Amino acid sequence: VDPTHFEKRFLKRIRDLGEGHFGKVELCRYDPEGDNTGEQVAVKSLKPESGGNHIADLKKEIEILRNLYHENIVKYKGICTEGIKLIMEFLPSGSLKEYLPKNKNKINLKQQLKYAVQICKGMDYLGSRQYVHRDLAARNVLVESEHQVKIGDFGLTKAIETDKEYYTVKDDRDSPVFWYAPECLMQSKFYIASDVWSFGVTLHELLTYCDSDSSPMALFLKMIGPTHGQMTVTRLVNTLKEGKRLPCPPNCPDEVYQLMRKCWEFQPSNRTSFQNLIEGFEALLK
Amino acid sequence: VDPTHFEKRFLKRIRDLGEGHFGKVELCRYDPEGDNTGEQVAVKSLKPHIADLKKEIEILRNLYHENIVKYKGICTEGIKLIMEFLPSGSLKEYLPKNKNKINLKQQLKYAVQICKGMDYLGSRQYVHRDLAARNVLVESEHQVKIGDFGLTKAIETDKEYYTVKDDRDSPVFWYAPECLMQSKFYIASDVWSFGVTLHELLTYCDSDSSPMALFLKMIGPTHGQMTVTRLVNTLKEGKRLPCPPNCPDEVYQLMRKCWEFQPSNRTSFQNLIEGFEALLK
Ligand SMILES: N#CC[C@]1(n2cc(C(N)=O)c(NC(=O)C3CC3)n2)CCN(Cc2ccc(C3=CCCCC3)cc2)C[C@H]1F
Ligand SMILES: N#CC[C@]1(n2cc(C(N)=O)c(NC(=O)C3CC3)n2)CCN(Cc2ccc(C3=CCCCC3)cc2)C[C@H]1F
DSSP states (O other), rough: OOOOOOOOOGGGEEEEEETTTEEEEEEEEETSSSSSSSOOOEEEEEEEEEOOHHHHHHHHHHHHHHTOOOBBOOOEEEOOOOOEEEEEEEEEEEEEHHHHOOOOOTTOOOHHHHHHHHHHHHHHHHHHTTTEEEEEEEGGEEEEEEEEEEEOOOOOOOOOOOSSSSOOOOOOOOOOOOOOOOOHHHOEEEEEEHHHHHHHHHHHHTTTTGGGGGGGHHHHHHHHHOOOSSTTTHHHHHHHHOOOOOOOOOTTTHHHHHHHHHTTOSSGGOOOOHHHHHHHHHHHHH | OOOTBBOOOGEEEEEEEEETTTEEEEEEEEOOOOSSSSOEEEEEOOOOOOOHHHHHHHHHOOOOOOTTEEEEEEEEOOOEEEEEEOOOHHHHHHHHGOOTTTOOHHHHHHHHHHHHHHHHHHTEEOOSOOGGGGGEEETTEEEEEOOOOOOOEEEOOTOOEEOOOOTTOOOGOOHHHHHHOEEEEEHHHHHHHHHHHHHHHHHOOGGGGHHHHHHHHHHSOOOOOOOHHHHHHHHHTTOOOOOOOOOHHHHHHHHHHOOSSSSSGGOHHHHHHHHHHHHHH
């Protein structure tokens, strides 16, 4: 038997974990013994809908996650074929967005800096394999335990071609624009330095314990004036050009805010790296 | 009796003409004799904004020009703007239906009449911000009139521009790049919109070669959130609407001078008037 092969007849759906880009992540139990004793797994699959090659993109995402092995990347477990499904480990603590509001008392600055280092190690591993992530946000950072996080979704991940610095996207609809670097918004070009910008925003979230009233979206929309959505993105672009950035989170020491600010240099070439952030956080943790 | 006060009791509804920015323009007969003999008028009102309608009323009341739709008065209880009725409607409805009658010479005379109406508005220090074929009314085969001023704004003396930015329903496919990027409106922003409107007139307002259709073919039906950035980016690359079918190159060149990226580089309405008059000799 192939232990990465999950038979559909044994994969009993429990409930939805997430919805997004014409598909869903569901909690299922794999129960070949039929007694509710099998392992819980997270299952990604497309709605019957599909089209503008949603299938070829999921199949690419499967092949991406299958060959990633890092302690800060969610584990591939296998596939279910029929409309293919990606099977992953289930992390019952969910994302930082679920976990941090409930665990403020147990998660102090030292733990938040450790989680920051673990996200950066994950992201630097993905960069080392020539991938741009394009969706780095607290909602995609999963909690393994109070001491460990893992990057938990790869649905926008693209390979940068060898001898090229960026990937140009066509398919655009559902962009998380409040996490996107200016080159992504203005020119739909994604560099590794674009993942750093997003990392800066995800650190802001981590340091505000993912409070909905302090989310990047809620703070950017307070900043930017009367506007349509059609006009939202262009007003956001104009604010970033003038040099406005998310404010320092409450209780956030200025030395951590300075690391975050280096993520948000307007020009990709001027931004800090992931290895540089890891160094700066470890220095704070000594 | 004030001949600009219209009594609500004698304003008989016939039908709707259009809808926009949280209200409508209806056809009514003002019929104080109650025998169906009263004049037809166009009436702009809000559903149950008020302050902006009052400003629009005060702008139009004080504009007098052969190529600007005639203010007739108000109905007060709430307020309604009463305008002259032009039964031939907008260029968007008229051109498709009258291609046999309207040749290039007549299209160039409509172009001059729009430019004269627009340069009059400019000299009163207004920026229109909504110049499109759907807002140019046909008086007759030989005469057009700018027919709606609902987005019109004053430019402050010794300022070059007005910043909106009550922004949400912009006609983006007619907007200059300063309007898209910074929400800034100059007299030169109206020259860019005129360029798009001359494109519509020269294609006899065909839906399939509207500025919107043509720009979306060019950038893709992408997202709308991202639609406007992608449009900004395409105008930066230097791409413009193509030459309409059958449109001579020297007309197209005057059109292209409306679409210089920098406002300070765009043609004036006076230069457009003279360039066309030169073509009609
Ligand atoms: N990372 C992350 C967040 C998601 N997630 C994964 C898990 C997990 N493995 O335990 C999880 N656990 C919980 O919540 C626990 C119960 C609290 N949550 C995955 C992505 N989804 C959004 C999503 C959904 C669908 C798609 C698709 C895109 C294209 C292909 C088809 C599907 C992409 C992203 C949210 C959480 F489920
Ligand atoms: N210009 C122009 C186009 C409109 N129009 C005016 C006339 C007219 N005077 O004879 C007219 N004739 C016809 O159609 C004939 C029958 C073919 N058509 C006016 C604007 N409307 C959109 C519109 C509607 C409502 C609003 C409001 C904004 C806020 C205040 C309340 C209403 C703005 C623009 C389309 C045609 F009626």
